[PDB]
Design an enzyme around this catalytic site. Sequence first.
Site, PDB file in Angstrom:
ATOM      1  CG  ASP C  71      -1.546  -1.344   1.125  1.00  0.00           C
ATOM      2  OD1 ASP C  71      -2.217  -1.794   0.485  1.00  0.00           O
ATOM      3  OD2 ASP C  71      -1.090  -1.893   2.500  1.00  0.00           O
ATOM      4  CD  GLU C 198      -9.503   2.830   3.635  1.00  0.00           C
ATOM      5  OE1 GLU C 198     -11.184   2.613   3.868  1.00  0.00           O
ATOM      6  OE2 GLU C 198      -8.779   2.411   3.658  1.00  0.00           O
ATOM      7  NE  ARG C 213     -12.007   0.176   6.395  1.00  0.00           N
ATOM      8  CZ  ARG C 213     -10.485  -0.341   5.442  1.00  0.00           C
ATOM      9  NH1 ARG C 213     -10.163   0.388   5.184  1.00  0.00           N
ATOM     10  NH2 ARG C 213     -10.479  -1.690   5.063  1.00  0.00           N
ATOM     11  NE  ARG C 291     -11.777  -5.439   0.364  1.00  0.00           N
ATOM     12  CZ  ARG C 291     -10.201  -4.849   0.768  1.00  0.00           C
ATOM     13  NH1 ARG C 291      -9.401  -4.796  -0.548  1.00  0.00           N
ATOM     14  NH2 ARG C 291     -10.393  -4.223   1.745  1.00  0.00           N
ATOM     15  CE1 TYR C 325     -10.006  -0.588   0.708  1.00  0.00           C
ATOM     16  CE2 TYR C 325      -9.648   1.579  -0.009  1.00  0.00           C
ATOM     17  CZ  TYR C 325      -9.622  -0.104   1.291  1.00  0.00           C
ATOM     18  OH  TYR C 325      -9.288  -0.568   2.557  1.00  0.00           O
TER      19      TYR C 325
END
Lengths: 389, 389, 389, 107
Positions: C71, C198, C213, C291, C325
């Site tokens: 990240d 976020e 979140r 996801r 996302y």
Amino acid sequence: IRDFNNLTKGLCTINSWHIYGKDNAVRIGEDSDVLVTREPYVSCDPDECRFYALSQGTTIRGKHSNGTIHDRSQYRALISWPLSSPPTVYNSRVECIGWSSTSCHDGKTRMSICISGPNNNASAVIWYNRRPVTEINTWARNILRTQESECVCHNGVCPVVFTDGSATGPAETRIYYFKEGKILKWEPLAGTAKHIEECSCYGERAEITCTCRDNWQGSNRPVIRIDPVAMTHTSQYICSPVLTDNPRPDDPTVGKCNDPYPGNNNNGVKGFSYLDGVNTWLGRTISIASRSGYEMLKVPNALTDDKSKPTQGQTIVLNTDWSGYSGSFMDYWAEGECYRACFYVELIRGRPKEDKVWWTSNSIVSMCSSTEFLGQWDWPDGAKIEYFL
Amino acid sequence: IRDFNNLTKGLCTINSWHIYGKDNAVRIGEDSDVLVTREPYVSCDPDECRFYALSQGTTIRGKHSNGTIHDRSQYRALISWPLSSPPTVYNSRVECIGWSSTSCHDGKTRMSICISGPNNNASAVIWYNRRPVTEINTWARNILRTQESECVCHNGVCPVVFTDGSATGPAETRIYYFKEGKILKWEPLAGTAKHIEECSCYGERAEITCTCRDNWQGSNRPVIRIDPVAMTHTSQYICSPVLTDNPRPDDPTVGKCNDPYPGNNNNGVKGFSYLDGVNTWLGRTISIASRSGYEMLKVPNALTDDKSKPTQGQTIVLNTDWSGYSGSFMDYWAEGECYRACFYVELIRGRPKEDKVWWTSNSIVSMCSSTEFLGQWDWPDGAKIEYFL
Amino acid sequence: IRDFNNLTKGLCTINSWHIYGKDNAVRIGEDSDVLVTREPYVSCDPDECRFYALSQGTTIRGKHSNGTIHDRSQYRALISWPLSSPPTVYNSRVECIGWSSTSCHDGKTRMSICISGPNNNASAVIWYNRRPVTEINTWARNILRTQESECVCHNGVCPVVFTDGSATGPAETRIYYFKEGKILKWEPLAGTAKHIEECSCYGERAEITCTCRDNWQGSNRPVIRIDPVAMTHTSQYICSPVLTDNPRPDDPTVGKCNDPYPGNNNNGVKGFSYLDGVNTWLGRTISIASRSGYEMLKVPNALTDDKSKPTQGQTIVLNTDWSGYSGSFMDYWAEGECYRACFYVELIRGRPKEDKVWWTSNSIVSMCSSTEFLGQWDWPDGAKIEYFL
Amino acid sequence: DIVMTQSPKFMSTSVGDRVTITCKASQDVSTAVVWYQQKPGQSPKLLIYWASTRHIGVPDRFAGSGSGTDYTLTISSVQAEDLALYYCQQHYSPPWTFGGGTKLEIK
Ligand SMILES: *[C@@H]1O[C@H](CO)[C@@H](O[C@@H]2O[C@H](CO)[C@@H](O[C@@H]3O[C@H](CO)[C@@H](O)[C@H](O[C@H]4O[C@H](CO)[C@@H](O)[C@H](O)[C@@H]4O[C@H]4O[C@H](CO)[C@@H](O)[C@H](O)[C@@H]4O[C@H]4O[C@H](CO)[C@@H](O)[C@H](O)[C@@H]4O)[C@@H]3O)[C@H](O)[C@H]2NC(C)=O)[C@H](O)[C@H]1NC(C)=O
Ligand SMILES: *[C@@H]1O[C@H](CO)[C@@H](O[C@@H]2O[C@H](CO)[C@@H](O[C@@H]3O[C@H](CO)[C@@H](O)[C@H](O[C@H]4O[C@H](CO)[C@@H](O)[C@H](O)[C@@H]4O[C@H]4O[C@H](CO)[C@@H](O)[C@H](O)[C@@H]4O[C@H]4O[C@H](CO)[C@@H](O)[C@H](O)[C@@H]4O)[C@@H]3O)[C@H](O)[C@H]2NC(C)=O)[C@H](O)[C@H]1NC(C)=O
Ligand SMILES: *[C@@H]1O[C@H](CO)[C@@H](O[C@@H]2O[C@H](CO)[C@@H](O[C@@H]3O[C@H](CO)[C@@H](O)[C@H](O[C@H]4O[C@H](CO)[C@@H](O)[C@H](O)[C@@H]4O[C@H]4O[C@H](CO)[C@@H](O)[C@H](O)[C@@H]4O[C@H]4O[C@H](CO)[C@@H](O)[C@H](O)[C@@H]4O)[C@@H]3O)[C@H](O)[C@H]2NC(C)=O)[C@H](O)[C@H]1NC(C)=O
Ligand SMILES: *[C@@H]1O[C@H](CO)[C@@H](O[C@@H]2O[C@H](CO)[C@@H](O)[C@H](O)[C@H]2NC(C)=O)[C@H](O)[C@H]1NC(C)=O
Ligand SMILES: *[C@@H]1O[C@H](CO)[C@@H](O[C@@H]2O[C@H](CO)[C@@H](O)[C@H](O)[C@H]2NC(C)=O)[C@H](O)[C@H]1NC(C)=O
Ligand SMILES: *[C@@H]1O[C@H](CO)[C@@H](O[C@@H]2O[C@H](CO)[C@@H](O)[C@H](O)[C@H]2NC(C)=O)[C@H](O)[C@H]1NC(C)=O
Ligand SMILES: *[C@@H]1O[C@H](CO)[C@@H](O)[C@H](O)[C@H]1NC(C)=O
Ligand SMILES: *[C@@H]1O[C@H](CO)[C@@H](O)[C@H](O)[C@H]1NC(C)=O
Ligand SMILES: *[C@@H]1O[C@H](CO)[C@@H](O)[C@H](O)[C@H]1NC(C)=O
Ligand SMILES: [Ca+2]
Ligand SMILES: [Ca+2]
Ligand SMILES: [Ca+2]
């Protein structure tokens, strides 16, 4: 301009054709990051003319070009780029997402409509000044489709012809009149035509002419003439024996004005014409069975006289070369007494005929009209399917 | 500017040359998506100067670069791009489609003419403000050709010299005067010249000078001086013994003003000169047999005195390096007392001399004129034909 | 515009969703110079809308894409590019350098904030009109983070939510109010929320809504509503049983408004919602564990009623397809009665789930809201992890 | 490699007369043919290039011609001292190939 456009002129004397635009997209795409497209076209802004075309979301060379013979998917998207440059990854502007388009500029800014969806539940969204304004969900639920070339606007109003339904039989074709993105009204197709697909349209003297495609039974092409002002239209066929759709039966001696001409059912190819009395010119592939060659023919009064055979011609793509889809366009903002008529010819390279490769892309050729008699040349896509192996 | 241009100045004192532009196109094209070109040139807008050149429709590296030694085809196209950047797929603007060009800007916008066609039935189309305005179909039917470098305009009027006919013998050369795309008049070539090809032209003090190419018998170059205002011209040869065409017979002691100088028939190479009395400078390749090396020579009064031998010189490309075509250009909108004279030298890499590869591209070198005496350097294309194997 | 923006409208009736933007970035990046990104988003200028995303400093294909699952690093950078074109090396604009961003435009110009640093000593720098104005060094010293999507500005003032601290437990979240780059004030997070990461935010009727979140204990999402005018905010949870975070416990019958809903600790995925009374729509992945899939649900009053189960829905990404996302955005300058609500869905392709390759990039899908009931389609990233081997 | 072929290899003309020495490339070499002369036991002297351009100071009595693949050198008013070997070379694309040389006997 900073003002709506009114089609105030008439077409110029069309005596021969001069090349206006050449892509060479497939030739350069064998070693450049070029997009796989099909259904190409050309539209002009006040400012500039550009090549438009439906992207497939891959480069010719990338391994995801495999199976781009399929017409619709969620990877397609109406894209746009400079006159005669290839449709490169780095110079294409995405106009909207979908697998059927039409795009035109009304003098003030432009309208682009991309249709998307599964075949039984598709939607049209009408973009105006690059923002989605209106959307139209399906009406007959089996593949809502539209123009595949530029639309024409008079004083804010742009008729766009849509078909929803079967390509093998009666389908629901409606003419929509938009102004600035909002729907001003829509009527259903009226007249003697029997099926409507992919109408090529141009505009002169406050009226809009559209040569379309009869997919069910037509080998002669059906014609819609739309009064943009009164918001009405009518549809008849091209009377001329000079059949222009493809595949076609061989041309007769006498033809059919108010009905489809028999012989090749459930097929066509998008096509165009310039209907102006003596100054009428038509274009067909040279081959009756296939999309090879493309030629222009002066056939005085072909709309109305049902024994009009051609008086002058011009070979555009050679019969030993591939062609594809054609459509009309004009630069409505160019300077002068009249409208310089122009068209384009998609050059389909790839599957199914050249199946040594698994992609289908195409190239584009454009020509506009000269009052002169300029001599002719043939204009091949140009790539060798053997260097991609 | 927003106003026509008038050539109100004279050339500046040309005392040496300073590099203005370098491409490095072939060197970078061994690993970038670069276009195969030839017949390059440079023209300036009010706004900017750009490299122009005839594309071949392929990248150096792509497999379709093979056989780009052929001069004309339907894949060629006049393209244009930033000063000294390579002619990349992603930064070239297509100006029009054809295999002979000329392009100039009249103060208001620019004229580009691309000639196309089969050799026996070719047509010129004159683009003005990026739209086709006029077109001119062939007159002698064997390869209609033109400038290959920028044209010059005075008050709207741009003389463009065209030749149609044989490169081995008498051909029909006509001077056309356009204004804004329309033909204002044209006359046929008049004067003592014997054949005209590829005229390099510059303009000063309301008059236009063109050093051309005598392909039939000339080894000295023929010169056309055009009054843009009165729309007339005349043609004589460069008197100087300093022969500048290529291949050439070795230079004599005394030369020939009103006739071709004998020795090498049916050949040449496009070339230029700056004819200004004492301030005359000429340029020739260094080799008499081949296009290797390029050098500039101050030869006071070379137009008129037939024993003028050079008084100062400058080596531009080394004789152990390749050259090619040269042509004049100036930035007519640059600030100052006078016209800074400039030229370009095409650097042909490829076939036929370096036939280890099958492409022919070229690089470009540009220099403008300094009043100073700046020291000299040689400027090689630079690529190694061995890294493309 | 040349004037600050005021959120004067309310959201439009959200009845279905129409595709607004499609990237196809990973599919085209298998043969084009595409950037490896993640944390994508979309923001609009008065002028245009663009895809924003955190670059990893490499192309998918280049050998330095290996290990882009991490990240944060010094090779990351907030970049930006045309609506629906891929994030290409040659068409990305670097907005600033860092591994957490947020960007918004206040009517006059735009604010971009990139956070950088080692985890224990990080700094935020606030760019305004493309120049660094303010910077904010860390406060709790363990990974200062922010929005990951566009911020919203009212009359010059833009609340931006930042968290600094642990993602496993209480962390220091502060709401900062900037105006033109300078800090106007900041307060600490107040309300019933328990952890903030976020935040997806949109703005209507002079108020700003942010669905964030909860990383510590939340499976229902916490909501911050900020008065931009008075410079205050509050935070509660989404009452609805329709849990929207991911991974999540299975949805209950009755839920929890003023507390986190138990079940999956130390995890989440950035997400959004449109809270407007009856016109509330929520979006969650389809999978509770992973996801995969993404779907939209109309859940009237989901903010406030704690038994609101969905009344209408829409499948966006199929559960046999990957998502990632999501975040809200609107074109605040688009013409009309109201705000067209829109969102985006990051499509993460790569490691860890598809570890046959060593990169992690993603694609982007965008949709805006239609008052119509348009039919639905699923929108897959589309690449085959097997052609990169 | 372009092959240049000369035939015959020996030729006899009288004084004051004429000889024509044929040379022949094996593909169109575009008049890029050089003719050298090698006087008995000396270097070659470049006589003509591009089929007919005389080099610096060879007398106009040496005339060349040609097209395509067929070229010829003519010598008029043959001096007793034109007895030498005449060689065509190709000067179009690498490598530069020569012809066998034709010997000119004086009769
Ligand atoms: C320099 O350039 C100029 C300008 O281009 C050159 O002059 C032009 O050259 C053209 C060729 O000479 C010429 O076009 C011809 O014009 C005649 C009228 O005089 C026209 O009838 C011709 O069109 C028919 O023939 C072509 C092939 O030549 C066909 O492809 C075309 O389809 C037409 O024939 C078919 O349709 C007709 C109508 O129904 C039928 O009568 C005919 O039977 C035929 O039908 C069969 O084939 C069809 C499909 O191929 C099939 O569907 C059908 O079922 C049947 O089986 C042609 O266009 C231009 O008029 C001429 N222009 C000028 C100003 O001179 C000039 O030569 C060039 N100069 C040099 C030195 O090269
Ligand atoms: C720093 O830079 C400065 C500035 O550049 C340097 O000074 C300059 O340096 C140049 C070289 O010294 C000098 O140029 C020379 O100028 C003389 C006049 O003084 C000029 O005659 C020279 O040109 C002839 O010679 C060159 C080779 O040197 C040839 O390439 C050229 O073609 C000229 O010769 C040929 O043509 C003439 C005219 O007909 C004939 O008389 C001659 O016989 C010859 O002909 C044969 O070859 C031809 C083709 O090659 C063929 O066609 C023909 O048939 C014959 O067979 C040369 O240009 C500059 O004037 C000088 N400038 C200044 C301001 O000083 C300085 O040295 C540099 N400093 C350092 C430390 O390096
Ligand atoms: C043309 O297009 C139109 C427009 O799109 C089509 O009509 C639309 O079609 C949709 C599908 O038919 C329809 O959406 C559905 O609406 C109902 C309300 O009537 C809604 O409840 C549905 O949502 C539930 O079911 C979907 C799967 O179908 C689930 O993915 C979703 O999460 C919802 O179920 C889960 O959450 C609920 C709330 O808590 C629970 O009650 C339920 O138990 C379930 O929970 C389990 O799974 C969760 C995760 O998957 C998990 O977290 C949880 O813990 C449980 O284990 C669905 O959205 C649209 O309303 C409809 N719109 C219109 C205008 O018609 C039309 O069909 C198309 N036509 C053609 C010819 O194709
Ligand atoms: C993609 O292209 C490949 C070859 O480039 C196609 O390969 C064939 O795939 C079918 C199965 O669908 C096999 O029966 C053939 O024998 C395969 N041939 C080769 C040379 O491998 C492939 O079908 C294309 N499509 C997809 C979806 O992968
Ligand atoms: C394209 O380039 C190839 C090699 O890159 C050329 O190859 C020669 O083709 C001729 C026939 O035209 C053969 O006689 C030679 O032996 C071939 N050599 C090689 C290495 O294959 C080819 O001619 C070029 N042109 C075209 C039109 O393909
Ligand atoms: C970069 O990717 C390579 C393969 O593309 C990774 O390779 C593995 O490296 C570890 C050591 O860190 C070895 O134990 C594995 O056996 C390697 N496998 C292969 C196929 O070589 C590599 O780890 C990646 N990262 C770096 C930093 O190089
Ligand atoms: C356009 O056409 C309409 C109807 O013909 C006319 O009333 C209007 O003033 C015209 N506007 C322009 C910009 O030509
Ligand atoms: C250009 O030249 C003409 C004739 O010399 C003159 O009459 C005209 O006013 C000049 N215009 C400009 C812009 O210099
Ligand atoms: C914006 O909002 C403020 C407070 O609502 C108002 O006073 C100001 O005049 C408005 N300005 C604009 C450009 O709408
Ligand atoms: Ca049909
Ligand atoms: Ca010559
Ligand atoms: Ca959680």
